[PDB]
Design a protein around this ligand. Structure first.
Ligand SMILES: C[C@H](CCC(=O)O)[C@H]1CC[C@H]2[C@@H]3[C@H](O)C[C@@H]4C[C@H](O)CC[C@]4(C)[C@H]3CC[C@]12C
Lengths: 13, 225
């Protein structure tokens, strides 16, 4: 996945 | 001049709640004052701070009214596309009252050919004498930019950005009533904020200290590959 860390942070409550 | 309407006041409260929520771990502020002063230590501290700022930026953005209603890929594109500009605005806010942070920046492997123009830019932002509400709204406005690269539903972003611009225009009349050009000057600085996206990117191609690496998050968001 592209920008895997950014996605992780966006989806993490 | 023209007062904020009740719904505008509510929007501002949500933005200010979110802007003042998260900050920097005190372990990091400890290093700014106490850690060794070398280019290598400075590079590691500054990139640690920048990584933390991205995390705080994500948390701020998620609490902007309407942001979580946007398409998920567009959310990612807005965050990645605004990270540098938001970091510039925050840098401006900090430096327009820690000279130790400035001194670390000046001995970090970054050329004076980049630092001097950027600190002049931060000072040009400081001359506007913005309140925290204005910094917060300007930051929300750059995040919710309908003209960013890769946005699929630009009209959806525009309907979130337009109310912020209306609130900011009123804040300018409320906080700087004797300077009716203030809002126009803020928007002029927004335009030049965008030109420094490219300078930062060009600087990154050469910023290296002892062949150290940028953190994984900075590699993602600053496109260091
Ligand atoms: C992360 C902190 C903001 C922390 C906070 O939110 O309080 C920024 C405040 C000053 C910024 C630095 C300052 O703007 C100078 C450099 C600008 C450059 O484009 C990125 C590296 C920089 C060295 C940059 C890295 C991030 C910080 C150090």
């Amino acid at each position: 996945k592209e920008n895997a860390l950014l996605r992780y942070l966006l989806d993490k409550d | 001049h023209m007062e904020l309407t009740p719904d505008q006041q509510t929007l501002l409260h949500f933005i200010m709640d979110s802007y003042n929520k998260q900050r920097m771990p005190q372990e990091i502020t400890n290093k700014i004052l106490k850690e060794e002063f070398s280019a290598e230590e400075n590079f590691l501290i500054l990139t640690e701070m920048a990584t933390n700022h991205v995390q705080v930026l994500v948390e701020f953005t998620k609490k902007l009214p309407g942001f979580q209603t946007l398409d998920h890929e567009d959310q990612i594109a807005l965050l990645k596309g605004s990270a540098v500009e938001a970091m510039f605005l925050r840098s401006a806010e900090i430096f327009n009252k820690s000279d130790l942070l400035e001194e670390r920046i000046r001995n970090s492997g970054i050329s004076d050919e980049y630092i001097t123009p950027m600190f002049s830019f931060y000072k040009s932002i400081g001359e506007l004498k913005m309140t925290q509400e204005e910094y917060a709204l300007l930051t929300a406005i750059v995040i919710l930019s309908p003209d960013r690269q890769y946005i699929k539903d630009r009209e959806a972003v525009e309907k979130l950005q337009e109310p912020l611009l209306d609130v900011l225009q009123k804040l300018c009349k409320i906080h700087q009533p004797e300077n009716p050009q203030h809002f126009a000057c803020l928007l002029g600085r927004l335009t030049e904020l965008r030109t420094f996206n490219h300078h930062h990117a060009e600087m990154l191609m050469s910023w290296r200290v002892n062949d150290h690496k940028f953190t994984p998050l900075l590699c993602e968001i600053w496109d260091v590959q």
